[PDB]
Amino acid sequence: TRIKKISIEGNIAAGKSTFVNILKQLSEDWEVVPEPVARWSNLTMEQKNGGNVLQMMYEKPERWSFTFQTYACLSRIRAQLASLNGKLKDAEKPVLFFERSVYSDRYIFASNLYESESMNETEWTIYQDWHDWMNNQQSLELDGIIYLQATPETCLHRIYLRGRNEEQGIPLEYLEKLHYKHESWLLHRTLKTNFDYLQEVPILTLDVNEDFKDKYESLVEKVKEFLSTL
Amino acid sequence: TRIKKISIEGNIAAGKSTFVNILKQLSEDWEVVPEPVARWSNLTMEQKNGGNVLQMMYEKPERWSFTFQTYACLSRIRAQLASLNGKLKDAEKPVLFFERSVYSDRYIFASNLYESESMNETEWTIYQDWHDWMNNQQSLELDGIIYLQATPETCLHRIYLRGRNEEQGIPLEYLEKLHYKHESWLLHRTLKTNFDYLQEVPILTLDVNEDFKDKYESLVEKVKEFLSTL
Ligand SMILES: CCCN(c1nc(-c2nc(N)cc(N)n2)cs1)c1cc(-c2ccc(S(=O)(=O)N3CCN(C)CC3)cc2C(F)(F)F)ccc1C
Ligand SMILES: CCCN(c1nc(-c2nc(N)cc(N)n2)cs1)c1cc(-c2ccc(S(=O)(=O)N3CCN(C)CC3)cc2C(F)(F)F)ccc1C
Ligand SMILES: O=c1ccn([C@@H]2O[C@H](COP(=O)(O)OP(=O)(O)O)[C@@H](O)[C@H]2O)c(=O)[nH]1
Ligand SMILES: O=c1ccn([C@@H]2O[C@H](COP(=O)(O)OP(=O)(O)O)[C@@H](O)[C@H]2O)c(=O)[nH]1
Ligand code: NA
């Protein structure tokens, strides 16, 4: 029993947290690593740091993007490594579902902040150097990715449903930019990364435009079929 | 042959680079890891990043202290790990001399930037969390420390001798602040760190107020005697 590592990827309010909370309940061999940033957006020193840096980011992204992206990624690596070393000992078919990955940290979020001039060149090059190196110090490489594909308009509506005050100002245009990056990475596979194995990792794309909270059985059936091929 | 790891510590322009370049020549079992920041202060992507972030630091320390301290420390860990895995295979008595340590990064430099309000609380807490964790991902723990002890006035004179344009404005008061931290850490051993073994690590203190470039044999004799006790 080597733990299978599966990333759940998708735009803001696509339904990843909803989907991962469904999956965790369906099997004692299935565990989840919620995204650190998602927990900061609700006591611990990480949550106090994370809440401060997220609020400062909303005020002045061009000051705080580097600090935020480095702490978000380190927080994720720590939480993923903890689960990998903690859980599913004596699972028959152990699967750990990551809410997003170190790859979404860099290729979706940090990349967009650089493209939006919220990181300068030095900040972005330091970040990529840090990421290239931080990742080689290995056991987190993915067996597969599940892409929850929703339209920007769907994600905008779901930001409205979730009702976090800080997010109600997010424009469609931001969601469209993140959507294009996800489509380039996980559908067209046009995106060049510095992680050669990712070109070859299996991807399951699930259309989650339709509400699935009370009607997810088809989605899970595709997950179980995907898992059996890995 | 397990490599002995020895940090050379001391104030700005105490003579660490001079001393470490003397030591490296005296034995094929002796290798040195120059300090990354020292190389930025003279082609590689690290040097271009480092030169940019050092120049920006001089302009606006309260913007760049967090970015600088995180890149300086990661650059040091990478260079120390490279030497540890690269060199002194088939040395009889292998010794690797580190120009400063991850401990001087945090307890001398980053601590002073926090105390000078060039990092806010969140920046300083994120930095310490990053450092606590980054260090546990181990083989860099020190067998000993060599403290090159000079007066602030001596170090001020040696900044004048070395003649880097960017450093000629450094005030005595800065040197006195760094001196007090080194005395608390390595002489009085009053400084509380989060690394329990450091309380117990042997320290050799060498007085380097007197010029040693052509008269270092006494200093080296004390280093060889120190090494034989480890
Ligand atoms: C819920 C989103 C929170 N949010 C972010 N989160 C992450 C993040 N990083 C992870 N590694 C993991 C992870 N889970 N999350 C990164 S940044 C965030 C985003 C913006 C922001 C940015 C760029 C546009 S833009 O490209 O549309 N554009 C630019 C040109 N102009 C100004 C116009 C606007 C927009 C916006 C916006 F709208 F959200 F504010 C501002 C702050 C914040 C905290
Ligand atoms: C050669 C020193 C370069 N320098 C630095 N290097 C490092 C460093 N970090 C490593 N992890 C490793 C390593 N090798 N080096 C950290 S910061 C640096 C220092 C200052 C700076 C800071 C504080 C005072 S102060 O406390 O005296 N004080 C404060 C209140 N007021 C304003 C008055 C002044 C002074 C100064 C000064 F003088 F050097 F500028 C400004 C920028 C810079 C790059
Ligand atoms: O099929 C769904 C999926 C999500 N949501 C709602 O959409 C919002 C965003 O979902 P989630 O938090 O899971 O998005 P994530 O940001 O985690 O992808 C929440 O208010 C969910 O309750 C929904 O009503 N039906
Ligand atoms: O015994 C000594 C030690 C140092 N120096 C000079 O002092 C300056 C600072 O020395 P170093 O660069 O070694 O200091 P570090 O910052 O590496 O401690 C340089 O110009 C050295 O040539 C000197 O003249 N005599
Ligand atoms: Na479960």
Ligand code: NA
């Ligand atoms: Na040598």
